[PDB]
Amino acid sequence: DQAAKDRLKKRIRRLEKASQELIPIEDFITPVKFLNKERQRPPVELPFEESERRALLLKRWSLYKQREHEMERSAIRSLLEAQEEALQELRLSSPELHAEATKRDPSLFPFERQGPDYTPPISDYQPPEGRYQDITKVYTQVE
Amino acid sequence: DCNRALLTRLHRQTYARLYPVLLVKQDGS
Amino acid sequence: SSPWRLLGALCLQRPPLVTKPLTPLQEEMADLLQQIEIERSLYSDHELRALDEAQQLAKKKSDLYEEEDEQNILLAQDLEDMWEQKFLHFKLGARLTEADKKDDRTSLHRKLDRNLILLVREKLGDQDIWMLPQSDWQPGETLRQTAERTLATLSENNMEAKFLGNAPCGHYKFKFPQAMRTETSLGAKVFFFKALLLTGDFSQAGKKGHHVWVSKEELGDYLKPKYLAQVRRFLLDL
Amino acid sequence: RRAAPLGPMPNEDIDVSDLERLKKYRSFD
Amino acid sequence: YRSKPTHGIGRYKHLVKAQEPKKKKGKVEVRPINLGTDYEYGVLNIHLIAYDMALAESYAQYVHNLCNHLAIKVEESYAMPTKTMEVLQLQEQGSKMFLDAVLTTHERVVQISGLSATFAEIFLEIIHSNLPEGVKLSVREHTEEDFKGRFKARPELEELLAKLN
RNA sequence: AGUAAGGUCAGCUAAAUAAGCUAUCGGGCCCAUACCCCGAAAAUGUUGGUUAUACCCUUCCCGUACUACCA
RNA sequence: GUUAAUGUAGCUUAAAUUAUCAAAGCAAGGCACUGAAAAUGCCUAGAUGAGCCUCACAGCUCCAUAAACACCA
Ligand SMILES: *C(=O)[C@@H](N)Cc1ccccc1
Ligand SMILES: [Mg+2]
């Protein structure tokens, strides 16, 4: 009776002393479905004319990538300077509002935003019905 | 600058073939 | 107080709705990346059925000793035809809406791949100048709230916009002309706050004569060189 | 009986505090 | 030697961190969650969710590399476990369902350290502007509940917890 | 004081392959109870370490045991 | 227009026909490499602000950066 509660308390502590296991990521673990299922491509043939243009194009891509970084780094530099100069300028004129503008205000997080889509959502669209089953292979282990 | 990350590849060594599939949302997007 | 007039301006920005077109250089590399994916990949289940047709067809040509003539019903190529016919029959929206064709610089359905910054026309000194929405700072009110109040003062608006913390994003100082310049009010200081438009739009009462939406490329046309310079600093090109 | 060094110490320029801010070597070469 | 002027020329333990070894019995992710500084936000999780594995990871790398250039400390770049949903569509002229397709969701999280309040507007401006296509950005606080999804389920405790209640 | 030495189901025992008997809970047999037949549940004093645990060691606690002599 | 600060690549070396072998070093990028970084391999892009003076010291000036008197709603 009272002793059985003691074991129930102790069984709680015994499981607590164990490590908190983490679910392995199946994305990084290829299943045995692709494990040498004769699904090998034939020996790839690379034309010499295709090889020279492919490597030469990658040289421009490296140069073009640097161009994107230069403008992006310049853009964030100007944005950082513009906000920094305005914040300091306002401090001298209105010291009281400067403290409010710099203190951590929980009015931003969470900041959930989605990315743009290929096409805009059309007007008066009626998608068909159905149901969403979630297999989500479970991983339960005991110690 | 919305085309600065979509240009990529499935960085793996043992992966099945993938095909471009245009999925439409609940709306027309 | 101070001779300068404290004003809180709101820099409302609309995020792009559609993906921007790929540059010619990016198109060539996108083909290359997709080409490499197929070369370094394995055979998918659909690609397996392509050889399954070859396995059965080869029997139908030489090894006419197949045990079971039932087999399947559909074919891998036929399956693609089933989805192709539905896809070709099905139609989507247009990236370039009627707003672009009619140059309706007020509706939110223009330049879906670009960013639109809200501009309104205010009459000061018997002169109409296009400017960002703004309001005067008041006692017992933070500068961020002044821009927040400006959104509620818009003519018949239901828009919901997320602000960005409390720190400002820019400044602009101007002095009144000497005709109306006094020591009491030498000029004013305009502070800009950026916000992202989530949902909502203006009503149908007044559109052309109240507000317009433009991108940074044509933003300078409606503005003036003195006021334009400070606006472009915090406006991230996109 | 500690003595005073005759010149600057080798590693006294860097700040002991705030180790994470200082960039590391990350390489052997 | 102590009395020589060249004493302590070999001092190095104050240059590297202590680097406490992960003891077998003391192995625990002891994270001192910082909350509410004068100008520094707390620990934040940048949840990037997308349907395509390649697209989700590609933008995850950009966020992680951007923080390093901006001197933003990155505590970890772990990955939330994936979730698979079976898409079933309704058959026309009927009621019985049929297997339409199998779609999965991939989530990549780039945990970041504290940042200045001024930089919060600028840093987030770059992120949301570069969302390639359909990536669901989610910048939420790093509470233990948001971090529990990475671990497994423990029915052994739930058997005891149910009887405890 | 020192040394020796033990704790296991409600209870007592044997093994560490955690079992056996009894008690307890449910049902059957009988006019009813008990006997009897059938079924189920139940624990390794405590902390830490023992590849990992258990019989082990360690810590904590309860209780048991011997000796304390020559002037 | 006018009044006061500055102008080799991102910082910085040598250099700056002052002489000398020479425009350097580190950053910053692409690709490959268990998944992130980082290492490693292969690989991309480059400035001596401008003229004058000195031609055998190097600086002035110009222009520009940039602040100011100061046009502004
Ligand atoms: C602008 O040029 C001025 N007319 C603005 C103005 C100042 C004071 C009173 C009214 C208008
Ligand atoms: Mg890497």
Automatic annotation (TrEMBL), chain A:
Q: Where is the composition biased (Basic and acidic residues)?
A: 97-106
Q: Which InterPro entries match?
A: Ribosomal_mL40 (IPR019192), Ribosomal_mL40_metazoa/plant (IPR039145)
Question: Where, per UniProt, does this protein localize?
Answer: Mitochondrion
Keywords for the protein's UniProt record, in alphabetical order? Mitochondrion, Ribonucleoprotein, Ribosomal protein, Transit peptide
Q: Where is this region: Disordered?
A: 92-130
Cellular component GO terms, alphabetically? mitochondrial large ribosomal subunit
One Pfam family, please name it. MRP-L28
- Name-wise, this protein is Large ribosomal subunit protein mL40
State the species of origin: Sus scrofa (Pig)
From TrEMBL, chain B:
Specify the protein name: Mitochondrial ribosomal protein L55
Native source species: Sus scrofa (Pig)
UniProtKB/TrEMBL annotation, chain C:
Subcellular location(s) of the protein: Mitochondrion
GO molecular function terms noted in the UniProt entry: structural constituent of ribosome
The cross-references to Pfam families, in alphabetical order and at most eight, read:
MRP-L46 (PF11788)
**Gene3D superfamilies named among the record's database cross-references:** Nucleoside Triphosphate Pyrophosphohydrolase
Q: Which UniProt keywords apply?
A: Mitochondrion, Ribonucleoprotein, Ribosomal protein, Transit peptide
In this chain the Large ribosomal subunit protein mL46 N-terminal domain maps to 4-100
Keyword Ribosomal protein recorded: yes
Task: Name a GO CC annotation attached to this entry.
Answer: cell junction
Q: Name the family the entry cites.
A: Belongs to the mitochondrion-specific ribosomal protein mL46 family.
The name of this protein is Large ribosomal subunit protein mL46
Give the organism the record lists.
Sus scrofa
Automatic annotation (TrEMBL), chain D:
Q: Can you say where in the cell this protein is located?
A: Mitochondrion
Q: Which family does it belong to?
A: Belongs to the phosphatidylethanolamine-binding protein family. Mitochondrion-specific ribosomal protein mL38 subfamily.
Please report the name of this protein according to its UniProt entry: Large ribosomal subunit protein mL38
> In which organism is this protein found?
Sus scrofa (Pig)
Quote the gene name from the UniProt entry.
MRPL38
Please state which portion of the whole protein this structure contains, as first and last residue out of the total length: 27 to 55 of 380
